[PDB]
Design an enzyme around this catalytic site. Sequence first.
Site, PDB file in Angstrom:
ATOM      1  N   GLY A 177      49.181  25.756  42.646  1.00  0.00           N
ATOM      2  CA  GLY A 177      49.107  27.012  43.353  1.00  0.00           C
ATOM      3  C   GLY A 177      50.209  27.257  44.363  1.00  0.00           C
ATOM      4  CG  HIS A 234      55.323  28.716  36.063  1.00  0.00           C
ATOM      5  ND1 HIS A 234      56.288  28.274  36.944  1.00  0.00           N
ATOM      6  CD2 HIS A 234      54.133  28.414  36.635  1.00  0.00           C
ATOM      7  CE1 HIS A 234      55.711  27.760  38.012  1.00  0.00           C
ATOM      8  NE2 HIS A 234      54.401  27.846  37.858  1.00  0.00           N
ATOM      9  CB  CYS A 264      54.672  27.862  41.752  1.00  0.00           C
ATOM     10  SG  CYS A 264      55.023  26.212  41.127  1.00  0.00           S
TER      11      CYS A 264
HETATM   12  C1  LIG Z   1      53.392  25.791  40.588  1.00  0.00           C
HETATM   13  O1  LIG Z   1      52.236  26.057  41.354  1.00  0.00           O
HETATM   14  C2  LIG Z   1      53.355  24.318  40.165  1.00  0.00           C
HETATM   15  C3  LIG Z   1      53.678  23.336  41.316  1.00  0.00           C
HETATM   16  C4  LIG Z   1      53.470  21.808  40.878  1.00  0.00           C
HETATM   17  C5  LIG Z   1      51.988  21.431  40.756  1.00  0.00           C
HETATM   18  C6  LIG Z   1      51.830  20.130  41.487  1.00  0.00           C
HETATM   19  N1  LIG Z   1      52.997  19.991  42.343  1.00  0.00           N
HETATM   20  C7  LIG Z   1      53.995  20.975  42.031  1.00  0.00           C
HETATM   21  O2  LIG Z   1      55.075  21.063  42.609  1.00  0.00           O
HETATM   22  N2  LIG Z   1      54.226  24.080  39.023  1.00  0.00           N
HETATM   23  C8  LIG Z   1      53.765  23.624  37.864  1.00  0.00           C
HETATM   24  O3  LIG Z   1      52.585  23.358  37.645  1.00  0.00           O
HETATM   25  C9  LIG Z   1      54.817  23.443  36.766  1.00  0.00           C
HETATM   26  C10 LIG Z   1      54.785  24.642  35.810  1.00  0.00           C
HETATM   27  C11 LIG Z   1      55.725  24.480  34.588  1.00  0.00           C
HETATM   28  C12 LIG Z   1      55.674  25.763  33.722  1.00  0.00           C
HETATM   29  C13 LIG Z   1      57.156  24.064  34.997  1.00  0.00           C
HETATM   30  N3  LIG Z   1      54.559  22.215  36.020  1.00  0.00           N
HETATM   31  C14 LIG Z   1      54.733  21.019  36.684  1.00  0.00           C
HETATM   32  O4  LIG Z   1      55.238  20.926  37.806  1.00  0.00           O
HETATM   33  O5  LIG Z   1      54.268  19.992  35.949  1.00  0.00           O
HETATM   34  C15 LIG Z   1      54.197  18.692  36.530  1.00  0.00           C
HETATM   35  C16 LIG Z   1      52.882  18.522  37.273  1.00  0.00           C
HETATM   36  C17 LIG Z   1      51.878  19.485  37.127  1.00  0.00           C
HETATM   37  C18 LIG Z   1      50.666  19.344  37.800  1.00  0.00           C
HETATM   38  C19 LIG Z   1      50.456  18.237  38.620  1.00  0.00           C
HETATM   39  C20 LIG Z   1      51.453  17.274  38.772  1.00  0.00           C
HETATM   40  C21 LIG Z   1      52.666  17.415  38.101  1.00  0.00           C
END
Ligand SMILES: *[C@H](O)[C@H](C[C@@H]1CCNC1=O)NC(=O)[C@H](CC(C)C)NC(=O)OCc1ccccc1
Lengths: 304, 304
Positions: free
Chosen positions: A143, A41, A145
Site C-alpha cells: 500500500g 501497477h 507505492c
Molecule cells: C506498492 O505498494 C508495493 C510496495 C512493496 C510491497 C512491500 N514493500 C514494497 O516496497 N509494490 C509492489 O508490491 C510491487 C508491485 C510490482 C508490480 C512491481 N511488487 C513488489 O515489490 O514485489 C516484491 C514484494 C511484494 C510484497 C512483499 C514483499 C516483496
Amino acid sequence: SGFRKMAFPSGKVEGCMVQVTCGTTTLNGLWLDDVVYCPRHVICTSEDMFNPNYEDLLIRKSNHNFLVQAGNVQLRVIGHSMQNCVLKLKVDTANPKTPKYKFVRIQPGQTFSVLACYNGSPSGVYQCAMRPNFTIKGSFLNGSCGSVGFNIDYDCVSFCYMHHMELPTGVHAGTDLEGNFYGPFVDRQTAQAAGTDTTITVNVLAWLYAAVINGDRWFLNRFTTTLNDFNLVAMKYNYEPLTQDHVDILGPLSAQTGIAVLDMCASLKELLQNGMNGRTILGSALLEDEFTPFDVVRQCSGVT
Amino acid sequence: SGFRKMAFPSGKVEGCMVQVTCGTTTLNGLWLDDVVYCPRHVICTSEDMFNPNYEDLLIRKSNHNFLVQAGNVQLRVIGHSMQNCVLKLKVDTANPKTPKYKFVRIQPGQTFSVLACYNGSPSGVYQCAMRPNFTIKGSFLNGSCGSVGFNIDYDCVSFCYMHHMELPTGVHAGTDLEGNFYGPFVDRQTAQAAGTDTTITVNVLAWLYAAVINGDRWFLNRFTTTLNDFNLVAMKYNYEPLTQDHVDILGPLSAQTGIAVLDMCASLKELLQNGMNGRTILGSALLEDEFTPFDVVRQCSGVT
Ligand SMILES: *[C@H](O)[C@H](C[C@@H]1CCNC1=O)NC(=O)[C@H](CC(C)C)NC(=O)OCc1ccccc1
Ligand SMILES: *[C@H](O)[C@H](C[C@@H]1CCNC1=O)NC(=O)[C@H](CC(C)C)NC(=O)OCc1ccccc1
C-alpha cells in the site's frame, strides 16, 4: 550542536497526497495542478503483477475505473495516460494546495525525504540517499507505492522519487516523476539484482567533518595521503573513487574545520583498515554514508 | 519491509510556528488559538542568561516589546504572562490553522517528533526519545529554542516538548508545554549534569523484535533466562530493570514473532556480554534503544 538524520518538513507534500483505487488495488497518488501521478501497477491485480502487459491491461480501463479520493472528497477523472511507469490521471479540479514545484531526476549519492503514505494518508517522514546502485533503504509496506521523495529549496518542492517496489535484498526501488526507474529495474514481480552496494565516499568524509564540527575527533591522526593512494584502499572496501570535484565540494567543511581533505582521507583509511575498535562517531559504530556535504552544511548552519 | 527512524508528518505543527523577538533575542513560538507559547529566556540578553532573575527581567517588558511574526504577518500582542519556564503571549488573532491538540507530559522512554525551527520557520523533522535521564539527543543551534516535540494520534497533536538548552555533554533539555522542565534542569547558563544515561531496555527488545519482523535473526540463540537473572546483567550495563509490564507491552511483538520475551532477553544478554562481533542489526552496529514497542508496531503495521 548535535547531528541527526533530518527530513524536510512535509507539510507542502502532505497536501498533495491522494488515494487512487483501480479495482481491488489501492495506492497513493500525487495531486499537482489538475493531474494525479501514480504508479501504473495500480491497474494490476495481484496475479497480473508477475508478468504484466501494461499496455493491454490499461486498454481495459476507462476514466471512471480510477477512483481518486482527496481526504473524504472524491475527484472526477476526465482523462488518463501512461508515461513510462507512471499514470497521469487528469481530474477536473486543480489542487488548491499545489506548492511551487519541479520534477527532478536526482543523481546517485544525493539525499531526499520520503513521505511514506498509506491509503492517501501520510504515515511518517525520513531521509534516504539514492545509493550508487540506484536503490534506497527505506521503510515500505503493501500500500505504500506512490509515496514520493522530495527536496525543498526555500519555497520550491523538487520531487525526485516515487515508490514502486522492494527487491529480494530488502532494499527499495522506484522512479522519477516522469516514470523512469532509477537503476535497471522494471515494475514486475521477478527477482531483480541491484548489484554491489558501493559506499558514497564523499558522504562518509562529510560525516567525518560533521563529527569534528560537533566535537568527535578521536579518529584524527598524524597521517595524510594522496587521491590515488586513498582510492587503492577505496576499491578494496567497495568505496566510490574520490575525485577532485569531491575534494572541492568538501571545501567549505575543510575550510570550516581547518582539516585538509586528504588528511581526513588518511583518517578514513585507518578507520577502514583498523575498524573503530569499539568506539563510536556521532553515535554510530559504522561509517555513515547517507549525508551529503550539503546536508552537513545545511544542518550545521540552520538553513530553513 | 525495512525499519527506519520515522518522524510524524509535520504539516499540522508547521502551521503553528511563529517568530518571537524581544529586543535582540529571537526564537520560535507555538501559536495555538489566541496564545503564543515560547521559552521565557527570550527576554534575556546574552549577558542575562548566566544568572537571570526572570521575574525582575519580565517586569521591564510590556506587550509591545514582544514582536510576534507569523510568516510575513505581524501579530498584535494584547497580554503576557509567565508560567514556569514559558511565556504565554495573548494575541488578537486565533490561529486559523490551530489543529486539534492536547498538552501532555510524556514519560521517560517514550518517543516524539521534533520540528526544528529557526526564525519561526521549520528546518527539518526527526524523532527523539525522552531518555531515562530526561535529556534528548537532538540537533539544535542558536535560535532553535521554542522548537517543539509532538506525537499525532489520528487527528490530534499531543505537544510534549519545547526546546530550551544544551548541556555540556552535547545533549538537549527542555520543558513540557506548561513550562516545567523534564529532569532537574533550570534555564540558566550554568554547568548542569544529567546523570548516568541508562538504556531503555524494553525499547532495545522492541527493536530486536523489529529486526526479526524484518529478517534479521542471527542473534537468536538456544538460551532463555529469567527477569531477575537478566536484570543482574542489565545493572552491569546500566540498562533499566525489566518488569512484567514491559513483558506485557512486548506481548504483541512476542506473539507476532513467536519468540518469548525471556528468550529474546537471553539473546540480548549474549549481545551485551559478547558484543556483535562485527555484525549488524537493522543496519546498526550498536543496540538501539530509541524505538518504543508502539513505534515498532506502528511502523510495521502502516498506521496513519
Ligand atoms: C506498492 O505498494 C508495493 C510496495 C512493496 C510491497 C512491500 N514493500 C514494497 O516496497 N509494490 C509492489 O508490491 C510491487 C508491485 C510490482 C508490480 C512491481 N511488487 C513488489 O515489490 O514485489 C516484491 C514484494 C511484494 C510484497 C512483499 C514483499 C516483496
Ligand atoms: C535557544 O535557542 C538555545 C538553544 C541552545 C544553543 C545551542 N544549542 C542549544 O540547544 N538555548 C540557549 O542558548 C540556552 C539559554 C539559557 C537561558 C538556558 N543556553 C544554553 O543552552 O547554553 C549552553 C550553550 C549555549 C550556546 C552554545 C552551546 C551551548
